[PDB]
Symmetry: C3
């Protein structure tokens, strides 16, 4: 159930909270409309994560789902968060590399399906079905990582060195971090309950804070965000 | 209830599924950013339809609603699908004709209301009220078909013949197909239960597959999508 | 509970309804793509408000939430409305002043959080927590009013007099009107139940109709919306 993981939820809330404040207090004197975009997108990512982490700490983002033959604790807030949060990160990568609107739409589309589908799976009552949805969700993610890695990099090679290198660091961080989510999910309370909800929430916390604050820090502290 | 229509749901899932694969495997070597947009938009339409048709086949997209004096089987997944799916189709028509942002916003707005309002109606408990919502939803749709037929055609007359003719075919297919939905709804399990849920699901399946795969095929196999 | 406020809900439905019709019947012969945008955005604001006010009058937009030690009547339809309705108004102000995409994204982002967070609060079961969410929601709003007042005005000073003056009127109307919502909420049935649901619904009605129809009238009847 949901009680012993309260500490990882409280620390996540705190970290996202400070992360938001920090980025806010850094983009204040930014005149460049391009840089402005990056700060806008990158700052909202942790702000949203903050509200959803708080809904979990306070119990609102937790629901109970019966499957297998039991009542399981499902933190649904994560999907609400990721629904808007993952496309924003992808938007950062797209602007940095100047991606075609066509591809930006395909990624956002793929990403919405990846999260929607993941939510469905998490709330499904027939234990066996949850893994069908997991399969579909992972197929979507692979498609997004494929484009970021092979498609975007190519696009980044045409920009100046500062942009290409920063994109390369962000690229490696998101590909590695994002792929940990489906595994954590599969082995956690949403799938085969091998790992306790306690450790699971700690894993997501490290992944979420790394994928947003870390990502943001790497991006917002470089000169790439400028023209 | 929901059991005998499983075959139309399974066939729809299959068809949307293959339809997605096919479009994916066709836009692969497309360099034109314009064409890229059309493939992106047109491919996501069936992909979304696939996930929602699967949620209905697996039972997740089905809920029970009391009205009249009974518990009625309401497939709510359809609205989730159409919410993002109908505006994307409209986006295809808009790009093909180069519509004003003002009008694109009015259509997407009208369309969101048409689906939201339709969802409300489907889930309302006071039998009589469901038809008030149906009335509002149909008013919205008529407004969208009006613009597509009279407004868009005019816009299409300024493009080269290939574009004008393809737009004309797509225009006639969507106007005819879309107007069948409110009728199916009115005479189906969501309204006056004249037609059984069995036949109803078969009707929607033919309409959905025609409105997306068919539409996509007509669009993606022409040279209109190019500059 | 929900019954004696039916009259304010019926009058709101009526007013939004007529307000929509009127704007529709005024933007008909508009050729200017810019003006077209304003009519599109401004017209959908009341159209959405109409569907949500109707869902409240008909009872669908009302739910029951236990907190304090009682079952409280929570009109959740308001959030559905405002979710899309407040960002559209902000879009009007942004176009009128020609705001940077960066800032438009920050405002829409801030605004989505303000409404989402407000919804959460309204539906939370732990009485004390509802005010934490109220605090976060108000912080977001203050951030939006800050930018509109200090940021946008500056942007408006570079436009021609007609635009600057209309923006100034709209600016003062929204800053004053918007700030009344959190107070009404805090002292209404969603917070410290000082004011009865009866008077509360009357307050929101005057605020909603003023913030949309009024706003729209001031905007759509000026020459500012033109190039
Ligand atoms: C403008 C855009 C384009 C914006 C669109 C936003 C919208 C569409 C997002 C939806 C996101 C999705 C992904 C999340 C939804 C998940 C969904 C499946 C889960 C739904 O449940 C939660 C929902 C409803 O809450 C509830 O109210 C009902 C009505 O009163 C009740 O009937 C429900 O029961 C109630 O559910 C709650 O309580 C349950 C309690 O049960 C009990 O448990 C306790 C335990 O101690 C005890 O045992 C009791 O006895 C027992 O009964 C609990 O189980 C439930 O889980 C739940 O707590 O909530 C609505 C959430 C709201 C939508 C989230 C807001 C998220 C943030 C703030 C969004 C910010 C977004 C901006 C827009 C992004 C901007 C950037 C872009 C530009 C890119
Ligand atoms: C980024 C964007 C801008 C994205 C925004 C996305 C979001 C806002 C979309 C919402 C779309 C709307 C239109 C659909 C919502 C409809 C809503 C009214 C219906 C809600 O119900 C379903 C919801 C919740 O599931 C449930 O979990 C709760 C919490 O644990 C429970 O409390 C609920 O009870 C539970 O409901 C399920 O189970 C019920 C079972 O009851 C039982 O029946 C069985 C029968 O055998 C038996 O009798 C049992 O005894 C009995 O108890 C059942 O009745 C319910 O129907 C339900 O199954 O589900 C959340 C769905 C999720 C939001 C859908 C995802 C859709 C897809 C993947 C979206 C892809 C979108 C991308 C974003 C588009 C990209 C393109 C654009 C760029 C244009
Ligand atoms: C394309 C976009 C990018 C679009 C995205 C749209 C989407 C994500 C918007 C979501 C907006 C959010 C903010 C609102 C959700 C609030 C949420 C917390 C509340 C959820 O509840 C309502 C929901 C479900 O209804 C229900 O169906 C379930 C399945 O069958 C049931 O299990 C639920 O119980 C049922 O709930 C209803 O009934 C309850 C009744 O209980 C009873 O009370 C009576 C009283 O007499 C009696 O006592 C009975 O005995 C007792 O049991 C009741 O309490 C509940 O409140 C409820 O009535 O509803 C879905 C709503 C739908 C999503 C709203 C549509 C809004 C409008 C039309 C949107 C227009 C938007 C366009 C897209 C904007 C365009 C412009 C942009 C370009 C900027
Ligand atoms: C514990 C916390 C995490 C909890 C907080 C609750 C939180 C959920 C609610 C807050 C809402 C929050 C999500 C909003 C985030 C917005 C974020 C995306 C900001 C990114 O923002 C980007 C910019 C857009 O820039 P601009 O206005 O267009 O500037 C134009 C300039 O004049 C140059 O013009 P030129 O090019 O022509 O030369 O933000 C605008 C720039 C402005 C000009 C400067 C803004 C200053 C700010 C008002 C002050 C910064 C914040 C404070 C340090 C403290 C924060 C308090 C919090 C409670 C709001
Ligand atoms: C080609 C495609 C198109 C077709 C494929 C897609 C689609 C069909 C779905 C494929 C997913 C499927 C193989 C799911 C596996 C989970 C399943 C075993 C659930 C069993 O659930 C019951 C558990 C109960 O264990 P208890 O809690 O300790 O008690 O049984 C005990 C369960 C065990 C504990 C589970 C061990 C699982 C892994 C071996 C753990 C090791 C981790 C992996 C090395 C890392 C990532 C996962 C990898 C499989 C991708
Ligand atoms: C049974 C199934 C229905 C179930 C599947 C589950 C499903 C729900 C999840 C999958 C996600 C899916 C929704 C995503 C759909 C995306 C779709 C919208 C694609 C439309 O996509 C449009 C393009 C965007 O193009 P680009 O990257 O910008 O190319 C630039 C080029 O270099 C030219 O540059 P120049 O102009 O300067 O000259 O997609 C990018 C083009 C790439 C360069 C090429 C992409 C190749 C693909 C990776 C391979 C195609 C797919 C495979 C045949 C099999 C599909 C497996 C499935 C499980 C993913
Ligand atoms: C009681 C009621 C509140 C309940 C109603 C239910 C309601 C919820 C459902 C209705 C949907 C509604 C929300 C839709 C609102 C849309 C709104 C945003 C409209 C704003 O709309 C802006 C424009 C977009 O313009 P354009 O088409 O691009 O014009 C191009 C022209 O050719 C110039 O070209 P040039 O620049 O190259 O020179 O709308 C398009 C302009 C068209 C060319 C003209 C349109 C005419 C209309 C069809 C008629 C107006 C409406 C009627 C008076 C009655 C309304 C009935 C109602 C039931 C629909
Ligand atoms: C610096 C920040 C970062 C930190 C702060 C943010 C966060 C911690 C939250 C701050 C909000 C907090 C102070 C909430 C106040 C409501 C609380 C008293 C609820 C009590 O709820 C119990 C009621 C029951 O009364 P019954 O219905 O008549 O029986 O007690 C009786 C209650 C009374 C009736 C309530 C009277 C309230 C006001 C005095 C009414 C006057 C209106 C104000 C002048 C106008 C706007 C409000 C102003 C406070 C902003
Ligand atoms: C806020 C930051 C990040 C990096 C979140 C990204 C999340 C995902 C890519 C989650 C993917 C899922 C998959 C691939 C399969 C099962 C369900 C998930 C939604 C967890
Ligand atoms: C996926 C393809 C299509 C063509 C779906 C379009 C759906 C509609 C236009 C549905 C309209 C409705 C109306 C007009 C009235 C009652 C409720 C509906 C939502 C079914
Ligand atoms: C349709 C018109 C308007 C002007 C609506 C605007 C609404 C708000 C700014 C509401 C703000 C809230 C705050 C600041 C705090 C508690 C919850 C609210 C969502 C009501």
């Amino acid at each position: 159930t949901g009680r012993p993981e309260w500490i990882w939820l409280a620390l996540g809330t705190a970290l996202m909270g400070l992360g938001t404040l920090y980025f806010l207090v850094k983009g204040m004197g930014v005149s460049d409309p391009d840089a402005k975009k990056f700060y806008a997108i990158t700052t909202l990512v942790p702000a949203i994560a903050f509200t959803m982490y708080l809904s979990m700490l306070l119990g609102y983002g937790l629901t109970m789902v019966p499957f297998g033959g039991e009542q399981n604790p499902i933190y649904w807030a994560r999907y609400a968060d990721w629904l808007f949060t993952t496309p924003l990160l992808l938007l950062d990568l797209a602007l940095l590399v100047d991606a075609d609107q066509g591809t930006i739409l395909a990624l956002v589309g793929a990403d919405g399906i990846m999260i929607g589908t993941g939510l469905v799976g998490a709330l499904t009552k027939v234990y066996s079905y949850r893994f069908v949805w997991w399969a579909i969700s992972t197929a979507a993610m692979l498609y997004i990582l494929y484009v970021l890695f092979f498609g975007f990099t190519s696009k980044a090679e045409s920009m100046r060195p500062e942009v290409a290198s920063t994109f390369k660091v962000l690229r490696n961080v998101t590909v590695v971090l994002w792929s940990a989510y489906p595994v954590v999910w599969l082995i956690g309370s949403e799938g085969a309950g091998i790992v306790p909800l306690n450790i699971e929430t700690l894993l997501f916390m490290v992944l979420d804070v790394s994928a947003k604050v870390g990502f943001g820090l790497i991006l917002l502290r470089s000169r790439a965000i400028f023209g």
